[PDB]
Write a protein that binds this ligand. Structure first.
Ligand SMILES: c1ccc2[nH]ccc2c1
Ligand SMILES: c1ccc2[nH]ccc2c1
Ligand SMILES: c1ccc2[nH]ccc2c1
Ligand code: FES
Ligand code: FES
Ligand code: FES
Ligand SMILES: [Fe+3]
Ligand SMILES: [Fe+3]
Ligand SMILES: [Fe+3]
Lengths: 193, 447, 193, 447, 193, 447
């Protein structure tokens, strides 16, 4: 539907993702994707980070969250690095972050943090070429509370690819988030979106 | 408070009143005596290389536009329209020949000049003196090997002189390596700490590494990892500390070229740095070639910090006494292969960026230490920086500045706070100079 | 179920809407309504405002958001205008707002805004009289970020009527929101709820 | 700051220090010298027409209850219980014979009197002097053709005198049209701007329209649309500007009766206004009948603004130096058909209400201009309002006040800030008068 | 899956709840639970508290919200009361709170409050032993606005047990919430999570 | 403001300037003259019974660690590291032999002593005087029947003397009942009120109960329920009010042992209290045995309040002039059956905790009364506390203190604010004593 020459504010990437979901709707797949994301979020909320890695994350994963520099809507000359990577992790890098969370000398984890995740707007579509892969889009509100009066709320859209895996255990092979706030007001982004 | 008389920092920089991290009246006073007076980091050549390229930056709480001129120079201007004061530029970077205000349409050139006023002839006739209506210009803009600093005070020393004895230590990496590039855009996060808390930590705090970063050292897979949980103390002369007249200082950790990078980069980096060091031995001598590939944790007074080799580059942008906006860039050597540059930049953000797991370990330390400065029973308490006092030297044959010949100590805190007291109690650069005529003697007392 | 003489805090309007959903539940319809709203929200989030108008909005639409004056719960004499219309738009009026968003001299749209919408609590029920019409209720959290450190979060319940349309393209014929905050703390309400 | 001596506004109102939009100490000082001294908009007869009807309103940062008395007058009182200070009324409008405090149950009449105290006889006996315990009453409450203003200072001029020369311009629409009604409830939104930023914009800023509102003009389908993106400048004498002794001022755009309304209302409005103008020609003369159907952008000093014909009515309620709570009502002519009244009110909110697309274009301009007033390098900078200076006149045969005979200029800013300086540097109304004895000469200098 | 000896940050309770949902998934049950919670939230949002008690709450209910004291992650000696009960209500106690809300002298309820609830991450599993009982987990964002400029947002995970009841009217027999913020910044917790 | 001269509280405590609930400069001044000077509640023996047990508490805006020593005493220390000022303890309770700072690893004992410094020998050699680096200790820590209070001022009266005449009323329940336990952890909520608003309400406001709590009385099913909506006024001598030299005061409601508890606890409580009273008659006499089972609403100056029998125990922790962090515990008699203890604690939270339906009725009263103290036209207005003035007595044969022999009045407000004025206008305890040498005469004037 979308024509980005007419819909002036829409990026080419965003228009490509619309196209992927508006065509070929499979209600069963949507429900399966909802279940999968709800279970992933539950594992993360209870800080079962090893179980999350083992049950939900593929060996070939790219887990990426970018921060895009603010540029003029009419900019066409300046061509330097548009974004930086808050996260751009392979499996081993995720494992390092999980070990950091679980280390008993991670002083910032005492008293124990409290996480609550809200997953919405789930859409799913099979990849056209690789039948092991499912494209899942979802939005997340993540609430992190700690130390009596610290509360940080994160908001994001997630563009994921999940592989079928084996034995029905679906695993994340790519997560991409373009974080919407340029200057963070949550102390850090030390959370798994 | 009378800042001419109030002892905020004790003699020799041995202690500071805790209120300095929390007092809002002092923060306002720092805007005048620290931020409006001293050299502040703006950008790098690599971010505005072509005519018309610009970025926005903070200088204290002010915002400036930093623009590459047609003649290749850089000028910076307050990001404030000369008509009714609207913010002129709402983006972080771009390329343009000028900037038009969204309120009444006044158009300013990249050179700051008021170039056009809508319907000028019909409305102002010839009454508008556009020549007197250019954007308010940053008085001084200078480069240190591509790193661009600004200063609002025309009376400041040249940037090279302001770096003082610290410049000698930075030159191997900043100059002799062939030069560095800054990889943008930066991460940007607000922390509930005073700007001095991270600035003091980067200028001279090696003591905290093993304990604060225990978890990052252990899980991280990095070269300094033997320190996790204070399991071990660095060797002999594993490093040194230095400080300078104008407040800049750093720690030096010999040979630590891979820095905070995880084991996934260690071999490649150690090979690259060692190969360049071998070439540098013949050009700048063995000691300076070794400094090139040694990890420097330094603060360029007041609020710009870096970890060389690790490649971390920070600006601690002040917002109020307990709020700072942290900007994080990566620095890379220009002659590194592109793929290594990319991996290094990602690793800098991985460890010290917005989701930096090492930077996360420091949050509570900097935020609570700052916020405690507001608490009634702590305002007049004394923060201690006496470690190593009476063992620092001045005028060494090999290593310049006030130098503590040990890896761990508080030499650099003392030099930073000395310079800080001298500015807060001075009305101008001449008074700072008068207050600093014996800066190194004050720092080396008892030795 | 509800008796507003007993349930003293409940308005007659609100009790009428309960009645509409508690009776005749059609699970398939609920899922269809969820899909429809998720796609609408995706189009809005990527700022595909022309595509939203073309694909999601009926020619006969009334898009209305009201702000109700605070009155005493025991008030029975004062009978002046109870509310004002933050929005009360027909299709042409929506089109004017969409053109305003897309105009290259809309200075407030540079740098580009970031929107993230979270749609929940979806309920659907067919209209009793007009079989072209579906009543859909949903709640929305809308996050708008811009210019580094500006973040505004909106919260609302939406009472919609959607028509079947043609070719399976359902279109909004009425949206009604009674905005819950009387004094806005989001700078403006310049967002499509 | 010494406000007796500090030059916040330069001679003739030509410039103002940028700090006026950001300084919190000055904001506190304005509460005394601006808000506690001057006439502030409360409500309209149309909103409290019957005995017992009341609304709450702000007067500065204070909240008042405004109540229609049994005798048809209106009295206003602080919304604060005389016992322990609880807020008495928690709603925005209603009808009641009195107000009972939810803390200890004291009951006050609609006339402010303490009428009952629970268990008075058993607890206070005859010791309570209820006659001395009435709610704190707003000293002055007056009406301008149904628009109700309050003033805490009993020494203020009568409201009509305070409107000064601006009243002449308002009378065609406010009086000769048969009268206006205010359509409530208002929209209410908080903006991060100083109250003076929107007040100055409405009192005399036509210059910004083409540029700031480019997108609204182009997409909006309105009569002033030829100005989009400064594609065109208004004609000959397309309008004028005026200002007055006590600070009120406005722009006049000849014949622009449909104002900001989209093309969907243009024909109907232009017909209605032209028909009434034709009748008014015989009653008030051609010039004043034309003023009736001309678009007036005016600010009634300090913080009430309006666009006649467009029907926009605003109160810029101050919260702190960079926070204002904006109230938006619609004004309609009482004799317009009801359906037109309804459509006009919706159009006012569509364009200038909480989701007003025109009002949205002004947000960044007002918020950044205000916030920049806090930034260190801008506090002492000069906001310019010199457009048209040396071409304004006093005492014209047809158009009263200090008048700039051109549609676009800064005449009204100069009169607003003049009056502002005179109040901030004065301790009472007598001193303001002494400081304003040559108000028009100061504004017309060089002409 | 979860081994709390390995996943060091996970509590025994939390690991037990993972186990209950990861096994035996019934899509129909998930959808039924979603409907049920959406209807409950609608009744609460319109302040139909009597209808909520009558239609949604079982006579044997325990409605419990706790606040857990912050303790060191490595704490093993201090064994005093770990938490306090913000709520720990039986049916009669809920009825007292509902009467308090509906009393015309509850001055804090004028002008009328506005509530908007967002229910997500719904999971359901039948109890293994008592076939009248369904375990439902869900997360809730609750927005409360009042008096012009007061806005409070609550975030929580809910562990519920619902009984089949009679005539298809499911009723809550237990709600348990461990509130994530230790020091509340919402003025009070006077809301039904 | 000059607090030596400014009359914030009028003679005899009859009124107070409304600004006291809103002025931030006064709040800062209270940190010195109220919070740093007076006795503040910390914890109870029941919460730290064993060696090594500790909790954190606030004292004003400062945070302290309160620790049970090996010898059975309790010491308290600022929760601030003596090195660079990081907060030492991040939890609310625990058991430990010491506390290690997460920044550089300094280790302090439960006795406050600096016991270890990482790598001390290698880094500091023998230069570190650890004996002078213990945590900053709270000068005074004392117990009243297990309730532990702290005071930063070594010159304060002993806690028992500070309780003055109020101690006599508390002893039946605190001592003669066999003792109380505090059931933790407390609820914790922030309210947008000044700490004095709830403190004054608990010290002596019975007048508000029927009206403010109308809905809770009616739906609640409690013993004081006949008061709902002011349907009825308490009997004859249904109670009395008292106040004391150092500001503590309370109301006494004869026989109201079940307090605010709903009908579900009334029979069991009334039986339990009556049975113990019968035993106490022989030990402490009929009047004091009756006081034991009478409802006391009391404030231990400045900011600790309680309702005995109901079992509500509050700390109003100050954050700023319009922000208070409310801590709510339950108090229970040690010899009550465990199951009753549990039900009573839940009932305390049900009624007065974070979701306390009674406490909810007071929110708007305390927040708006406080916030109105910032509003310009109310700052200099007078909050009234004259109910019962001229009927209070001093030195009664049976009931000590300044006593109003009626259930409802403002006696206790007058004593609280008297003491408040005397502190805010005094620089030390000696001056407070000089200012209070005729405290009871001032309060009983006109009688
Ligand atoms: C290594 C050495 C010294 C340091 N200061 C701050 C980080 C850091 C890392
Ligand atoms: C038309 C003319 C002048 C004006 N000032 C503010 C809005 C506006 C519209
Ligand atoms: C009963 C009597 C007096 C009181 N003051 C505050 C609560 C309360 C309850
Ligand atoms: S404020 Fe920039 S052109 Fe007027
Ligand atoms: S505060 Fe209003 S009756 Fe007491
Ligand atoms: S701040 Fe505590 S050990 Fe340094
Ligand atoms: Fe660190
Ligand atoms: Fe405008
Ligand atoms: Fe109360």
């Amino acid at each position: 539907m979308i024509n980005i020459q007419e819909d002036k504010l829409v990026s080419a990437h965003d228009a490509e993702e619309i196209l992927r979901f508006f065509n070929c709707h499979d209600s069963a797949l949507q429900q399966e994707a909802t279940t999968l994301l709800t279970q992933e979020a539950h594992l993360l909320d209870i800080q079962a980070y090893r179980a999350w890695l083992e049950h939900c994350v593929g060996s070939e994963v790219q887990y990426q969250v970018i921060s895009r520099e603010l540029r003029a809507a009419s900019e066409r000359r300046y061509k330097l690095n548009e974004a930086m990577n808050v996260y751009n992790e392979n499996f081993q890098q995720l494992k390092v972050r999980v070990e950091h969370q679980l280390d008993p000398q991670n002083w910032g984890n005492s008293p124990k943090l409290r996480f609550t995740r809200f997953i919405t707007n789930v859409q799913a579509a099979m990849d056209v070429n690789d039948k092991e892969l499912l494209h899942i889009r979802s939005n997340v509100i993540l609430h992190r509370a700690r130390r009596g009066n610290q509360v940080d709320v994160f908001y994001a859209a997630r563009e994921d690819k999940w592989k079928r895996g084996e034995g029905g255990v679906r695993k994340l092979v790519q997560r991409f988030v373009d974080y919407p706030e340029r200057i963070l007001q949550t102390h850090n982004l030390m959370v798994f979106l | 408070m009378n800042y001419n008389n109030k002892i905020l920092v004790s003699e020799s920089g041995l202690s500071q009143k805790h209120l300095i991290h929390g007092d809002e009246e002092l923060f306002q006073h720092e805007l005048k005596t620290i931020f409006a007076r001293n050299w502040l980091f703006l950008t790098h050549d690599s971010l505005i290389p072509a005519p018309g390229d610009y970025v926005t930056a903070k200088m204290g709480i002010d915002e400036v536009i930093v623009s590459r001129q047609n003649d290749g120079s850089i000028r910076a201007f307050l990001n404030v329209c000369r008509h009714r004061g609207k913010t002129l530029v709402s983006v972080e970077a771009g390329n343009a020949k000028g900037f038009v205000c969204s309120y009444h349409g006044w158009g300013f050139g990249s050179n700051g000049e008021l170039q056009s006023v809508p319907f000028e002839k019909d409305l102002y006739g010839e009454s508008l003196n556009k020549k007197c209506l250019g954007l308010k210009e940053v008085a001084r803009v200078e480069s240190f090997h591509g790193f661009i600093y600004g200063c609002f005070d025309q009376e400041a020393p040249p940037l090279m002189d302001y770096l003082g004895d610290a410049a000698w230590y930075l030159e191997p990496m900043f100059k002799h390596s062939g030069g560095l590039e800054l990889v943008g855009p930066p991460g940007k996060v607000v922390i509930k700490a005073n700007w001095k808390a991270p600035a003091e930590n980067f200028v001279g705090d090696a003591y905290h590494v093993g304990w604060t970063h225990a978890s990052s050292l252990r899980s991280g897979e990095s070269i300094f990892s033997s320190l996790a949980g204070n399991a071990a103390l660095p060797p002999e002369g594993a490093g040194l500390q230095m400080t300078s007249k104008y407040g800049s200082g750093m720690g030096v950790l010999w040979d630590g070229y891979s820095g905070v990078h995880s084991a996934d980069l260690v071999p490649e980096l150690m090979a690259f740095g060692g190969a360049k060091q071998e070439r540098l031995n013949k050009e700048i001598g063995d000691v300076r070639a070794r400094i090139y590939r040694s990890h420097l944790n330094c603060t360029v007074f007041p609020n710009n910090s870096m970890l060389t080799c690790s490649g971390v580059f920070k600006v601690w942008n002040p917002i109020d006494a307990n709020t700072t906006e942290v900007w994080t860039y990566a620095i890379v050597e220009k002659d590194m292969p592109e793929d290594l540059k990319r991996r290094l930049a990602d690793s800098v953000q991985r460890t010290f960026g917005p989701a930096g797991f090492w930077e996360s370990d420091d949050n509570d330390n900097m935020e609570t230490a700052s916020q405690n400065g507001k608490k009634y029973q702590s305002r007049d308490s004394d923060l201690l920086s006496n470690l190593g006092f009476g063992e620092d030297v001045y005028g060494d044959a090999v290593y310049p500045g006030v130098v503590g010949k040990s890896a761990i100590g508080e030499t650099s805190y003392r030099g930073f706070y000395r310079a800080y007291q001298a500015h807060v109690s001075s009305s101008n650069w001449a008074e700072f100079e008068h207050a600093s005529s014996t800066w190194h003697t004050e720092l080396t007392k008892t030795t």
